[PDB]
Design a protein around this ligand. Sequence first.
Ligand SMILES: [Ca+2]
Ligand SMILES: [Ca+2]
Length: 112
Amino acid sequence: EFIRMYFEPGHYTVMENCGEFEVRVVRRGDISTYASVEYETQDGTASAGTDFVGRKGLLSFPPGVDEQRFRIEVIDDDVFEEDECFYIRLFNPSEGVKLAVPMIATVMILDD
Ligand SMILES: [Ca+2]
Ligand SMILES: [Ca+2]
């Protein structure tokens, strides 16, 4: 491998009423060709369908581009909740790419 991919930022703290927030994944090393990686949300103490909307996707990095950004929807309610967390993981990197820490992003939702 001559390409590494990882979340940057690796950690996101978001308010419950933010609507959506943006996650960023970076590529380091060989720029010069197309590369890709998949991601998927996963529950922590926060859960898809109650606290955020579950999402999986494919991130495409054209030649010359070293980052991709995607949005995640946070579900707002009126009920008081303690700080809760969910995660987003990278998987299935394209040929010649190796994931690097952090390859799981942490998301903490703060209640409003
Ligand atoms: Ca709220
Ligand atoms: Ca709430």
